[PDB]
């Protein structure tokens, strides 16, 4: 499906300059006559993949490059096809951010990084180290003020400190096996954060609103935020500086570098109109200036308007913190990493979990996709034609799954008939799995039965000479499994729990 | 199980005197002020967890009691005689007292006496006043535009009501009186006499730092202005088109979790410790409650010109319904106000969709539940919608019999929870990708098909829960589309 033609519907996060982007829309409607709808839905990064898969959604989706890998994997993004001229107009580092499986999946706009924002009047010389902030808070608390307030509710803001002494999402080679969330450097980082909160230098319940309020009302001396926030502080009439983030244990803070990216829905009949808007109307000096004038983008991907705005001490410090930080992976399971770490941070900040317990479960969550896919995909390819946990799980899946298939053959055959799978085009409707846990219940019986039917279909794919579409089926089952039941899976000690569930039934 | 024994966990909003309430706790021997506690409580309480005692205005407690999440309170007639009868009527749902009334709350006009010796009697003269004060680097008026509690006085002035005494059918949000009210507010913002992004913090900061001449707030705010030592007066809210501003009157109420094993301990705290002159004085000393329900300590504090003016604005305003739909009214109007204040919607579009939003759940349930019970064995819209559903749905059943029978034989129902599960599945099955009236009628038509089977299989009791569950997933997953189609009125026009 239902995407309207002869118009463009754009989704951008409300923290970005949507009113500036709508002014560009007005200019485009002046020139081409084409109506431009700029919306800022809540949870749009979660909504888009849902609606786009059912053929609905916006023409253009704006988010940081980290989300677009998952979208492109699911085929929900149009492959962008720019002139080499246009690519030479933007920074190479911005294109590498947008690239998935050697395909450019969206248009890079601007490079974003968290910097230390400080009240110049309250704090002429902000601290160089995390470790001296508790002493600073003692001093400022006597004046009825506080040293530091930022969003503890989002892992984007907590991560600089976690990554400082030792912390990575997935190591670049990206090795989706190597995850660095439960290592001793992350432990130190998060233990420092939890200490600030226990020592009442910060509060667990501080979010974006509470931190922005305090800084702009002059009640706190420092905040951690990105370029988007500068406009609301500019209005506040607080003399504010933008600087390097504090060092932890003598190592610099490593904030994740986001690239605001614009992607086009694979289901948009206005793919032509979309390209025009982004290339020739946005991503032009006059165009980027409109958005930046509403809410600053940081260092724009367009080399020309970056050259103009480079002078800004604010942008200089944004890029300074970027050099010290690392760019976000766009691999599809960034999502799961983010969700997992979000809970880790909040549970430790609250004391619902210890730092060790909290970070450990977040490590399990991040690693679950790779391992799930490994186990499921091996079983499916085995049936049609390394890891200790994997080996035992696959051993268990062989015995139990071969059993579920044998006992449920007649029901499984009925369902395969109804799916009418006789080619690859017919295979490309795997929104079947989306709702497998609709009634809301999760148990290992169900998960094995699902994988056992996955195997049944993988055997049919070999029959139907579609051997290559086995891995996509495995990927789809893995997707719904980890997407909807990550917490349950982690809570059950993951795949090790699976092996003990079926070990017990067998022997007793 | 979940809830602690031998202890009391109390939830009170952070804008109230929680430190005063904790001092009462000290004498007795956990007071928390969670964010979004009014939304959290119904969620946690249903899973058997939550606080022993929940503090909110009486408007939220009707929804809670409907869901069985509140203990029936059991006071002495002595105790009832200790409090005002109007406070008990506020705290009464289905002829049951569901919480303990504390204090009566109303918005008043708070003004800087030094900047504004004689504050304006009318809304209509404030834009001229702002021009004058702007030249001195000041502003006439700043209040919380982000909450409909503060915006409603002006909306309700020329014509506006949440309910008619409550007729859940009669809602007054699409009125030309409401239009005028909200259009006046939106004009102040377009003329830069006010700013769309002003919230509670920004307005309190401005008034207390002396930058604005007027604010709209309640008794709770007096302590922070008292610290500011801005010479402040508390007075009648400005008249709009010669009609008085009608603020919603809230009663701070204390309710007990039906899942609390300390129901006895809770009663003691509220009856013999809190609702005593000594006890109310502790909370009021932190943050003023206004005119307390306890007649004795009210008699003492009646003298306060501040409370006198709070009660003056109350007489002109209307007490909040505690019916369960108040929540949906609030959510809908909140969005109306913010979308008009921002210019995302025109006042007509914004108020129209807020009217639809308020009535959607009650109307949906009425229509769907009647159809389901009828097949087995807002009134004007309901009548026409049910009339339409009768002709169309009997048709969808006839044409979809083969598919509906296949699904019924698969999805056999044992209990209220299987009926709930059925609902979550049906929305997914019938609404593959798209929301259209065909799909919504097909969903309701399958609900009817199952309701007929429930009679067949001697489970007539499971029909009302099925209706409830279908309504739940219908409004939850398609609220925006439904409101965008002018709700059930659009359904009747689609099929004419």
């Amino acid at each position: 499906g239902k995407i309207e033609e002869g118009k463009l519907v754009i989704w951008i996060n409300g923290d970005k300059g949507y009113n500036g982007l709508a002014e560009v829309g007005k200019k485009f409607e002046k020139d081409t006559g084409i109506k431009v709808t700029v919306e800022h839905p809540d949870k749009l990064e979660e909504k888009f993949p849902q609606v786009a898969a059912t053929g609905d959604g916006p023409d253009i989706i704006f988010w940081a490059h980290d989300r677009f890998g998952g979208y492109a994997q699911s085929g929900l993004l149009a492959e962008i096809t720019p002139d080499k001229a246009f690519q030479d107009k933007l920074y190479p580092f911005t294109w590498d951010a947008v690239r998935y499986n050697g395909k450019l999946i969206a248009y890079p706009i601007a490079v974003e990084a968290l910097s230390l924002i400080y009240n110049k009047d309250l704090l002429p010389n902000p601290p160089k180290t995390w470790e001296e902030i508790p002493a600073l808070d003692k001093e400022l608390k006597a004046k009825g003020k506080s040293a530091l307030m930022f969003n503890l509710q989002e892992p984007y803001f907590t991560w600089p400190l976690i990554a400082a002494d030792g912390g990575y999402a997935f190591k670049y080679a990206y090795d989706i096996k190597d995850v660095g969330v439960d290592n001793a450097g992350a432990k130190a980082g998060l233990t420092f954060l939890v200490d600030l909160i226990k020592n009442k230098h910060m509060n667990a319940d501080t979010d974006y609103s509470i931190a922005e309020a305090a800084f702009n009302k002059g009640e706190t001396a420092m905040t951690i935020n990105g370029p988007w926030a500068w406009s609301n502080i500019d209005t506040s009439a607080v003399n504010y500086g933008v600087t390097v983030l504090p060092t932890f244990k003598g190592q610099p803070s490593k904030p994740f570098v986001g690239v605001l990216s614009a992607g086009i829905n694979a289901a948009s009949p206005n793919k032509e109109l979309a390209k025009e808007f982004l290339e020739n109307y946005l991503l032009t000096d006059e165009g980027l200036e409109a958005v930046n004038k509403d809410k600053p983008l940081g260092a724009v991907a367009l080399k020309s308007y970056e050259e103009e705005l480079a002078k800004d001490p604010r942008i200089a410090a944004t890029m300074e913190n970027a050099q010290k930080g690392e760019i976000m992976p766009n691999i599809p399971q960034m999502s799961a990493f983010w969700y997992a770490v979000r809970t880790a941070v909040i549970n430790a900040a609250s004391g619902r979990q210890t730092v060790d317990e909290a970070l450990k479960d977040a490590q399990t969550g991040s690693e679950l996709y790779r391992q799930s896919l490994e186990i499921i995909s091996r079983y499916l390819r085995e049936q049609a034609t390394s890891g200790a946990t994997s080996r035992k799980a696959l051993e268990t899946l062989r015995r139990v799954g071969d059993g579920v298939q044998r006992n449920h053959e007649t029901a499984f055959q009925g369902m395969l008939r109804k799916l009418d799978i006789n080619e690859d085009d017919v295979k490309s409707l795997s929104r079947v799995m989306i709702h497998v846990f609709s009634d809301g219940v999760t148990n290992w019986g169900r998960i094995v039965t699902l994988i056992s039917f996955g195997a049944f279909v993988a055997k049919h794919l070999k029959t139907i000479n579609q051997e290559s579409c086995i891995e996509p089926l495995a990927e789809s089952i893995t997707d719904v499994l980890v997407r909807t039941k990550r917490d349950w899976l982690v809570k059950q000690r993951g795949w090790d729990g699976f092996v003990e569930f079926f070990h017990v039934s067998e022997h007793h | 199980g979940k809830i602690e024994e031998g202890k009391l966990v109390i939830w009170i909003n952070g804008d109230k005197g929680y430190n005063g309430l904790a001092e009462v706790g000290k004498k007795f021997e956990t007071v928390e002020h969670p964010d979004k506690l009014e939304e959290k409580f119904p969620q946690v309480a249903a899973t058997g967890d939550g606080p022993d005692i929940i503090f909110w205005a009486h408007d939220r407690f009707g929804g809670y009691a409907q869901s069985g999440l509140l203990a029936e309170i059991t006071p002495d007639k002595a105790f009832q005689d200790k409090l005002y009868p109007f406070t008990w009527d506020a705290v009464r749902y289905n002829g049951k007292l569901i919480a303990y009334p504390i204090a009566v709350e109303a918005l008043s006009l708070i003004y800087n006496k030094d900047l504004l010796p004689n504050p304006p009697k009318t809304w209509e003269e404030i834009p001229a006043l702002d021009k004058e004060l702007k030249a001195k680097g000041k502003s006439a008026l700043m209040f919380n535009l982000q909450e409909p509690y503060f915006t409603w006085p002006l909306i309700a002035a020329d014509g506006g009501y949440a309910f008619k005494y409550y007729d859940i059918k009669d809602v007054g949000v699409d009125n030309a009186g409401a239009k005028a009210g909200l259009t006046f507010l939106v004009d102040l913002i377009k003329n830069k006499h006010m700013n769309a992004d002003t919230d509670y913090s920004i307005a309190e900061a401005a008034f207390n730092k002396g930058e604005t001449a007027m604010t709209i707030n309640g008794p709770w705010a007096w302590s922070n202005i008292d610290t500011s030592a801005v010479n402040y007066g508390v007075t009648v809210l400005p008249t709009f088109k010669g009609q008085p501003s009608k603020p919603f009157v809230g009663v701070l109420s204390a309710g007990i979790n039906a899942a609390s094993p300390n129901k006895e301990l809770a009663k003691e705290f509220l009856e013999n410790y809190l609702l005593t002159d000594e006890g109310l004085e502790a909370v009021n000393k932190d943050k003023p409650l206004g005119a307390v329900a306890l007649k004795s300590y009210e008699e003492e504090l009646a003298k306060d010109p501040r409370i006198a003016a709070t009660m003056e604005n109350a007489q002109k305003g209307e007490i909040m319904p505690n019916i369960p739909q108040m929540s949906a009214f609030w959510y809908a109007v909140r969005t109306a106000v913010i979308n008009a204040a921002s210019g995302r919607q025109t006042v007509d579009e914004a108020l129209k969709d807020a009217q639809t939003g308020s009535e959607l759940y009650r109307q949906s349930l009425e229509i769907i539940s009647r159809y389901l019970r009828e097949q087995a064995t807002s009134g004007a819209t309901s009548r026409k919608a049910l009339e339409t559903l009768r002709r169309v749905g009997d048709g969808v059943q006839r044409n979809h019999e083969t598919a509906f029978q296949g699904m019924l034989r698969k999805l056999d129902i044992k209990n209220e929870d299987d009926v709930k599960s059925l609902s979550r599945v049906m929305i997914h099955v019938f609404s593959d990708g798209v929301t259209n009236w065909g799909r919504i009628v097909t969903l309701i038509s399958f609900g009817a098909f199952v309701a007929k089977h429930l009679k067949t299989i001697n489970q007539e009791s499971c029909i009302e829960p099925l209706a409830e569950s279908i309504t739940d997933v219908l409004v939850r997953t398609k609220r925006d589309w439904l409101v965008k189609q002018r709700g059930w009125d659009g359904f009747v026009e689609f099929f004419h």
């Binding site: 449920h408 029901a411 009925g414 369902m415 109804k418 799916l419 929104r431 079947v432 799995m433 989306i434 709702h435 497998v436 846990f437 609709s438 009634d439 219940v441 148990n443 019986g445 169900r446 039965t449 699902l450 039917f453 | 598919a403 296949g406 699904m407 698969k410 999805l411 599960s421 599945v425 997914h428 099955v429």
Partner: peptide, 13 residues
Amino acid sequence: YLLFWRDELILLX
């Protein structure tokens, strides 16, 4: 859609 009704995998049409 593939669906679970009470430990039974179901194709529901």
